[PDB]
RNA sequence: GACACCUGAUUC
DNA sequence: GAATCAGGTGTC
């Protein structure tokens, strides 16, 4: 009910739907941006959503940082809990990338751990997410 | 398409939205102002927009005129189109007058017949609409 | 129902 | 940068 400002905050970009994706990650407090993906050619919202927070772990366990992330994606907070995003986008040559860095990070989610927590950011209460586009 | 010269262009002009809103109808082909609308304290742009066309319609059937009218707002030509204006301007004391002439605009849409062909002036290809502020 | 992502047309 | 509307997609 009240931020947690010490956290990571990501968040997708996109054109179209399925479409170009890009997703970042910036400093809750500040909005510094930590790490930022080099635009997929096609993708959808919920997989650039989900790639956003597994980035986010890698990133936070590469610095020894026990931060919570903070993620407005009600259907990617779910995908990295279950460690399985389950994506509909049909796979094939034009979308052989966004797979590719899919299973790879369904991948790291089950060769590792963490104990990051993976917070909902309430946009309802505390306006747009500090890494929106 | 082929521009219908032949015809009526209508646009609002507006300082703020919601903020002060105004609109006129000009003759396409010249430009001529036919009608102008006085300023209203509080609106919307597309309320704007709405009442421009029906303000149009009236004008051309009490002259019996079979022009066409052009409209740019791709939201007033669909209001007019189902003959009802779907705004979410607060209803108050200061939203009192435009709503007032947004009602009356609905009434005499359905209280009246008319086979004016409402277009969609193509600003992406002819500029900007005649009427234009 | 909910959480998101745009797209488009306008208004400043 | 910021507000007003309509349409369409990805998911739980
Ligand atoms: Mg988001
Ligand atoms: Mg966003
Ligand atoms: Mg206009
Ligand atoms: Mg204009």
Known sequence: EEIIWESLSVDVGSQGNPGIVEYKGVDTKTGEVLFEREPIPIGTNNMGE????????????????????????????????????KSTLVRNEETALIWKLVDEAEEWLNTHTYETPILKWQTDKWGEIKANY
């Open 50 to 85: 989900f790639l956003a927070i597994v980035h986010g772990l890698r990133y936070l366990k590469e610095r020894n940082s026990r931060k919570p992330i903070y993620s407005d994606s009600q259907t990617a907070i779910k995908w990295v809990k279950d460690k399985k995003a």
